[PDB]
Motif scaffolding. Structure first.
Motif, short mmCIF file in Angstrom:
data_model
loop_
_atom_site.label_atom_id
_atom_site.label_comp_id
_atom_site.label_asym_id
_atom_site.label_seq_id
_atom_site.Cartn_x
_atom_site.Cartn_y
_atom_site.Cartn_z
N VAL A 171 1.28 -1.04 0.10
CA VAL A 171 -0.26 0.17 -0.23
C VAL A 171 0.37 0.96 0.27
O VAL A 171 1.92 1.69 0.90
CB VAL A 171 -1.36 0.34 1.60
N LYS A 172 0.34 2.46 -0.55
CA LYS A 172 1.40 3.54 -0.41
C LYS A 172 1.51 4.86 0.56
O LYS A 172 2.27 4.91 0.60
CB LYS A 172 0.52 4.37 -1.69
N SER A 173 0.56 4.33 1.43
CA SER A 173 0.67 4.36 2.71
C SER A 173 -0.38 3.76 4.38
O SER A 173 -0.63 3.35 3.76
CB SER A 173 0.07 5.99 2.72
N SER A 174 0.42 4.42 5.39
CA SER A 174 -0.14 3.30 6.32
C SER A 174 -1.46 4.17 6.04
O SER A 174 -2.58 2.73 6.76
CB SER A 174 0.08 4.16 7.48
N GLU A 175 -2.08 5.30 6.44
CA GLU A 175 -3.46 5.12 6.02
C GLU A 175 -4.06 4.45 5.34
O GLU A 175 -5.85 4.08 5.83
CB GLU A 175 -3.64 6.55 5.43
N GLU A 176 -3.65 4.14 3.82
CA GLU A 176 -4.16 3.44 2.99
C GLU A 176 -4.11 1.51 3.73
O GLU A 176 -5.54 1.39 3.17
CB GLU A 176 -3.65 3.68 1.14
N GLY A 177 -3.46 1.65 4.22
CA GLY A 177 -3.50 0.56 4.66
C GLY A 177 -4.48 -0.06 6.24
O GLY A 177 -5.15 -0.76 6.08
N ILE A 178 -4.69 1.09 6.52
CA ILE A 178 -5.21 0.56 7.94
C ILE A 178 -7.10 1.04 6.93
O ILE A 178 -7.64 -0.16 7.16
CB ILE A 178 -5.60 2.21 8.86
N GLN A 179 -7.40 1.89 5.90
CA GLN A 179 -8.73 1.04 4.68
C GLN A 179 -8.58 0.19 4.16
O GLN A 179 -10.10 -0.68 4.40
CB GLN A 179 -8.36 2.67 3.85
N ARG A 180 -7.69 -0.46 4.04
CA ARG A 180 -7.72 -1.88 4.16
C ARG A 180 -8.67 -2.41 4.90
O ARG A 180 -9.54 -3.72 4.73
CB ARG A 180 -6.42 -2.86 3.31
N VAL A 181 -7.59 -2.74 6.32
CA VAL A 181 -8.07 -3.31 7.17
C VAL A 181 -9.86 -3.01 7.10
O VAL A 181 -10.03 -3.56 8.12
CB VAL A 181 -7.59 -2.90 8.18
N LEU A 182 -10.34 -1.50 6.68
CA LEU A 182 -11.56 -1.20 7.94
C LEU A 182 -12.61 -1.67 6.16
O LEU A 182 -13.78 -1.78 6.90
CB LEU A 182 -11.75 -0.04 7.21
N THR A 183 -11.57 -2.36 5.23
CA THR A 183 -12.71 -2.61 4.24
C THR A 183 -12.58 -3.88 3.49
O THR A 183 -13.23 -3.62 2.25
CB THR A 183 -12.78 -1.98 2.69
N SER A 184 -11.65 -4.33 3.32
CA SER A 184 -12.01 -5.96 3.21
C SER A 184 -11.30 -7.06 4.44
O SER A 184 -10.77 -6.89 5.69
CB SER A 184 -11.09 -5.88 1.90
#
Ligand SMILES: C[C@H](C[C@H](N)C(=O)[O-])C(=O)O
Length: 257
Positions: A171-184
């Protein structure tokens, strides 16, 4: 003429560095706040320098290219003397030490796992043996590099997984990684410092297992910089008087644990 300002490279990563919210427009250094911004302020007053903050142009921490050996990110900005200092949550590692210098560490951490609650999963081994729950890390950061080069059986298997799925799990950033945890169905390999911040904000998330390694963040300088040893001394002073502890408590300030 007068002494030029140092150019300080850094990267957006909450709660280390973020854009300050405000009612009127902010310009230049005033745009930024966070633990590493407070740290930079302290270093500037202790050492006696002025500075200009610039976010790393390519948005990366720094990793080495397989074929040509070239670095990217903040590490490369230092190598090429595009910045005088990197004041960021920049992990001290041997391969980085071969090309840039670091201060002694201002914070300690290890890689761990960010995931949702209410699953039976308890360790990296539980992820490595399956492929239903995806997992990954920030691209071109030290966590990615840890997995890429480790010979530990579990971590080698995890890298085989990430590598073949790079476009979908790095992922491009930690924020994006967190979003992945929330959305998949996804678990992020994230540094423990940052996990502690995230899980105190979002009570749906939790750390899985313990730390799988042990290391520190340091201020980066180009190799040979006279600022490195002076910054080490400043960090030790800030540590001894309790300022670093206070700074962490300020920025890390739910959730039940
Ligand atoms: C996001 C973080 C970056 C890491 N602190 C580095 O210096 O490359 C990570 O790789 O987990």
């Amino acid at each position: 003429g007068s002494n030029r300002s140092l150019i300080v490279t850094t990267i957006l990563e909450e709660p280390y560095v973020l854009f300050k919210k405000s009612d009127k427009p902010l310009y230049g250094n005033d745009r930024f706040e966070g633990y590493c911004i407070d740290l930079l302020r302290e270093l500037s007053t202790i050492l006696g320098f002025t500075y200009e903050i610039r976010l790393v142009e390519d948005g990366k921490y720094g990793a080495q290219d397989d074929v040509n050996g070239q670095w990217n990110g903040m590490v490369r900005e230092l190598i090429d003397h595009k910045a005088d200092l990197a004041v960021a949550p920049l992990t001290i590692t041997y391969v980085r030490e071969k090309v840039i210098d670091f201060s002694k560490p201002f914070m300690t951490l290890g890689i761990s796992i960010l995931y949702r609650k209410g699953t039976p999963i308890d360790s990296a081994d539980d992820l490595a043996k399956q492929t239903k729950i995806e997992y990954g890390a920030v691209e071109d950061g030290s966590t990615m590099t840890f997995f890429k080069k480790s010979k530990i059986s579990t971590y080698d298997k995890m890298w085989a997984f990430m590598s073949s799925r790079r476009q979908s799990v790095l992922v491009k950033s930690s924020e994006e990684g967190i979003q992945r945890v929330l959305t998949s169905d996804y678990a992020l390999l994230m540094e423990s410092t940052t996990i502690e911040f995230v899980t105190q904000r979002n009570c749906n998330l939790t750390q899985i297992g313990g730390l799988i390694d042990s290391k520190g963040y340091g201020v980066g300088t180009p190799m040979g910089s006279p600022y490195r040893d002076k910054i080490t001394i400043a960090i030790l002073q800030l540590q001894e008087e309790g300022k670093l502890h206070m700074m962490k408590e300020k920025w890390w300030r739910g959730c039940p644990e």
